[PDB]
Design a protein around this nucleic acid. Structure first.
Lengths: 555, 411
DNA sequence: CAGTCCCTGTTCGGGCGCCG
DNA sequence: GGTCGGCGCCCGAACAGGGACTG
């Protein structure tokens, strides 16, 4: 067997584990012909070689149809080999995005034919890639081959190719520094600011530099004229857009159909602004079967009709201009939903997106806004390597009040206020000093761990009092219930004294939403007040009415 | 032509496998130029995906410094090679370094490149350089010499370091020199003028052997933050309530604290704003508790075998308090920082500066870096902390969310 | 006292989208 | 078809740590 021009990558098995020894699946007669035809052709080209009984290893093999072609692709079920092969470090840290591309004079896209079949495998590792091809007769012994290149379906093939490909491109990139080559597997985006004459010269220089190592750049996959089809987009000299997206129109929706729908809506939200999947993802909670039919809710059908209407109009993104600043603007959309757009010139979006993760049982809009800012910041550094300037629907004084008083460290990068309703604001402010002339409530609550019963009430300085029996509750729920009672039966200004660290920690975080309906009711009562002052005193210390009300709610 | 010191991981432990986090443009260009130069000088060599190990990498600029510095997060590697630099080639810690009038730090990381690394251990020093918008796959390297920021580097170079310092230590016997990571702590009681002169003498004494920095510290002027009670002449119900809660919390540290007589003043169900006169028995319990807070805690001493732990509280108005301990309520040191860089505007910058100052104090006093309990969300910290880091070491940390109880550490 | 449990947050396993 | 890797989303279940209360 001749020597491949590309340097091979040494591969070992994990220490103390042998090669695979697994029997072949029964194959349909139509796939057997497709395999024998491909196996005999690859043997002639030196990509697979016959092996004898000295090779004790074996692995199954099958074939699937290529999309929009009569040719077949050969895949190997290397599930057992992948377990015992060494772990690799993937070099593909992410996926490039067209929003990070700079305007180049000339652009060229090419795809190499049969990438893996052009890169060799380590000589000492070829023995473990042994497989059997069953014949049309079950009694025929079968032809056993071993791979000489990267097998499609092996966990090391993508990591090996991407590193072998970068090693071949380095001498060209070193000689041609002003040439931009976006390398993703076999997809090479080549752009430059050289004149269109010298551009085609450098293109042919690279097509021969790649040919020297056995990499063929067919003219069928060659692209010289816009629009270019690169990574699922359409690249035009001034704008880009995603290749068309198709949503299913099922009359009866299963769970898997919603997942396919949600996935495409998330993919469309990159350039289609305003896509909401809140009510559609609510269909996936607490459901078990992938094939279970689920009826669409009224709020879900409205959200789908709105998403279909957005996909009707055409949208397009622009390219990154390093000379101008990066701008990102956010809008509160739904409860727990946020959308954003990243641009440099008004209405010329580089890309859009959405943030909707609900973190914690209790939160507010300021917390969710900060989480969205960080998600956009990380996303921007990935694509452009810098943090955009933010336009946030929150007052400068609103944010100043929050971060200065909050006990956690929190910060937002350079931003400015945009008056786009609805505006994010704090819905109530706990007083820092006790209110003079306000009734003082000493609340407490308790419960029995077994009976699940308890009381919750208060005692005031004006003689007022209340105790309420509670069924199916906990110590935490009662202490929150006691504060809810004090807020109900008090005026617009009220001082409340509790001993519940749990209740006091939730309220001081100024939440405006909660998974607990009791907290939501406490929030609703806090908004109606003008001045509220909470305080904490240690329990069982004989403090004020806190000991008098601890004895009333004892049982 | 130098022999390699054989190094092994701790038994039953594989190398670090930490993904690389996204980097800004200015840092990627800084790493590309440095790694290209270090590859030209044979300090590093490109590798491939057959190496299953990796370690995050980013770039920094020290205080008042223009040049970028390559920084690697080898914490995980240092956690998986701990027995080497503590049992076999440990470095003693001078107890007098913290008592000096002036202490200066020097970046001596360039000297580690003069010693080759063990060939079998180069596999674990792997790292990856990302590209903006993932233009290219990761450009991987591995170290061919002693890496900067690895806890095994100052232990191997220690024998070579002592012989370089012997001519200077003999000339200046009253000067204390300590080596931690890629830094050199030189402390003396000399006047500030001749102190900086002796540093430049050592800077040239190190240059002739094939090796520059300048950060000045004054550990003798380090102060602790005690727990203080207000001195009000008129007390309200709310004041006495807050006083009892604070004294109740402080009783976990000082067991002699009593709130019996003060709790008796809160017998009735009174309004918070109502003024309460202090009884005679309460005024004495208040005065005795103030004296107890002046006393040091009984039975608090540093254990070298225990890990250091540090907690930080955001007190607002640019105020930050901290406590260092190994066992709960047995605080080895308390303190408070004020008006740091980014005050009144950026907390992450203040919190980053606070971690650096606290870690530096821990190195001078005990020679260890504490594990931090940071008052910040995990995503908020992991997004911005690198933008304000100015040190060659990285302490360990965890994230807490303890709402403010009853202001124990700040009035 | 250690053993719970009530609460809350985090990590992970498993589906889809997309690209090669 | 039921091959591999990368990134993203959504959800539930697992894990895990801190309080308060009780034998």
């Amino acid at each position: 067997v001749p020597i491949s021009p590309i340097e091979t990558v040494p591969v070992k098995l994990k220490p103390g584990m042998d090669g695979p020894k697994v029997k072949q699946w029964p194959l349909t007669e139509e796939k057997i012909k497709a395999l024998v035809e491909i196996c005999t052709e690859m043997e002639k080209e030196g990509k697979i070689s016959k092996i004898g009984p000295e090779n004790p290893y074996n692995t199954p093999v099958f074939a699937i149809k290529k999309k929009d072609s009569t040719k077949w692709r050969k895949l190997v079920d290397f599930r057992e080999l992948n377990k015992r092969t060494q772990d690799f470090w993937e070099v593909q840290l992410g996926i490039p995005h067209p929003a990070g591309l700079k305007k180049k004079k000339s652009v060229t896209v090419l795809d190499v034919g049969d990438a893996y079949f052009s890169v060799p495998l380590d000589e000492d590792f070829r023995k473990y890639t042994a497989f059997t091809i069953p014949s049309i007769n079950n009694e025929t012994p079968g032809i056993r081959y071993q791979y000489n290149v990267l097998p499609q379906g092996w966990k090391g093939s993508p990591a090996i190719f991407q590193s072998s490909m970068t090693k071949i491109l380095e001498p060209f990139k070193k000689q041609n520094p002003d040439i931009v080559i976006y390398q993703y597997m076999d997809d090479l985006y080549v752009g430059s600011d050289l004149e269109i004459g010298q551009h085609r010269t450098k293109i042919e220089e690279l097509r021969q530099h790649l040919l020297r190592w056995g990499l063929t750049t067919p003219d069928k996959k060659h692209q010289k004229e816009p629009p270019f089809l690169w990574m699922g987009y359409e690249l035009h000299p001034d704008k880009w857009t995603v290749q068309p997206i198709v949503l299913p129109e099922k009359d009866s929706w299963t769970v898997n159909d919603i997942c396919k729908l949600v996935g495409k809506l998330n993919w469309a939200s990159q350039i289609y602004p305003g896509i909401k999947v809140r009510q559609l993802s609510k269909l996936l909670r607490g459901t078990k079967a992938l094939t279970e039919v689920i009826p669409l809710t009224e709020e879900a059908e409205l959200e789908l009709a709105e998403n279909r209407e957005i996909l009707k109009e055409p949208v397009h993104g622009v390219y990154y201009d390093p000379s101008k600043d990066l701008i990102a603007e956010i809008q509160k959309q739904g409860q727990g939903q946020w959308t954003y757009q990243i641009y440099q010139e008004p209405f010329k979006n580089l890309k859009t997106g959405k943030y909707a993760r609900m973190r914690g049982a209790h939160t507010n809009d300021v917390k969710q806004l900060t989480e969205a800012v960080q998600k956009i910041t990380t996303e921007s550094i990935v694509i452009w390597g810098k943090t955009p300037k933010f336009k946030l629907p929150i007052q400068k004084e609103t944010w100043e009040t929050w971060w200065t008083e909050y006990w956690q460290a929190t910060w937002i990068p350079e931003w400015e206020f945009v008056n786009t309703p609805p505006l994010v604001k704090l819905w109530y402010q706990l007083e820092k000093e006790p209110i003079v002339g306000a009734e003082t409530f000493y609340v407490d609550g308790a419960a029995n761990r077994e009976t699940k019963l308890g009381k919750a009430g208060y005692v005031t300085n004006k003689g007022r009092q209340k105790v309420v029996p509670l069924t199916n509750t906990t110590n935490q729920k009662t202490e929150l219930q006691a504060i809810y009672l004090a807020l109900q039966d008090s005026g617009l200004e009220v001082n409340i004294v509790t001993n519940s660290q749990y209740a006091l920690g939730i309220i001081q975080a100024q939440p405006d939403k909660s998974e607990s309906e009791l907290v939501n009711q406490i929030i609703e009562q806090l908004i109606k007040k003008e001045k509220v002052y909470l305080a904490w005193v240690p329990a069982h210390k004989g403090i004020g009415g806190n000991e008098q009300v601890d004895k009333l709610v004892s049982a | 032509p130098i022999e390699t010191v054989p190094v092994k991981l701790k038994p039953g432990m594989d190398g670090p496998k930490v993904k690389q986090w996204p980097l800004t443009e200015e840092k990627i260009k800084a790493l590309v130029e440095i790694c290209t130069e270090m590859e030209k000088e044979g300090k590093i060599s490109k590798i491939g995906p057959e190496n299953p190990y990796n370690t995050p990498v980013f770039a920094i600029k020290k205080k008042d410094s223009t040049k970028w510095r390559k920084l690697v997060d080898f914490r995980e590697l240092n956690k998986r090679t701990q027995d080497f630099w503590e049992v076999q080639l440990g470095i003693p810690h001078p107890a007098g370094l913290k008592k000096k009038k002036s202490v200066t730090v020097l970046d001596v990381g360039d000297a580690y490149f003069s010693v080759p690394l063990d060939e079998d251990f180069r596999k674990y020093t792997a790292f990856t350089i990302p590209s903006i918008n993932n233009e290219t796959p990761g450009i991987r390297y591995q170290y061919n010499v002693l890496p900067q920021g690895w806890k095994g580097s100052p232990a191997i170079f220690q024998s070579s370091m002592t012989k370089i310092l012997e001519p200077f230590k003999k000339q200046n016997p009253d000067i204390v020199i300590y080596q931690y990571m890629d830094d050199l702590y030189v402390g003396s009681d000399l006047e500030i003028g001749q102190h900086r002169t002796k540093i430049e003498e050592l800077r040239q004494h190190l240059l002739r052997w094939g090796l520059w920095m300048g950060y000045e510290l004054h550990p003798d002027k380090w102060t602790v933050q005690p727990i203080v009670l207000p001195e009000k002449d008129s007390w309200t119900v709310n004041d006495i309530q807050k006083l009892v809660g604070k004294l109740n919390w402080a009783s976990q540290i000082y067991p002699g604290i009593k709130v019996r007589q003060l709790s008796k003043l809160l017998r009735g169900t009174k309004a918070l704003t109502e003024v309460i006169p202090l009884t005679e028995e309460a005024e004495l319990e208040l005065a005795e508790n103030r004296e107890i807070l002046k006393e040091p805690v009984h039975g608090v001493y540093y254990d070298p075998s225990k890990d250091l732990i540090a907690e930080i509280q955001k007190q607002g108005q640019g105020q930050w308090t901290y406590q260092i301990y190994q066992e709960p309520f047995k605080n080895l040191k308390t303190g408070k920082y004020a008006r740091m860089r980014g005050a009144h505007t950026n907390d992450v910058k203040q919190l980053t500066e606070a971690v650096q100052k606290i870690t530096t104090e821990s190195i001078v006093i005990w020679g260890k870096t504490p594990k931090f309990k940071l008052p910040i969300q995990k995503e908020t910290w992991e997004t911005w902390w690198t933008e304000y880091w100015q040190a060659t070491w990285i302490p360990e940390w965890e994230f807490v969310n303890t709402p403010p109880l009853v202001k124990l550490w700040y009035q």
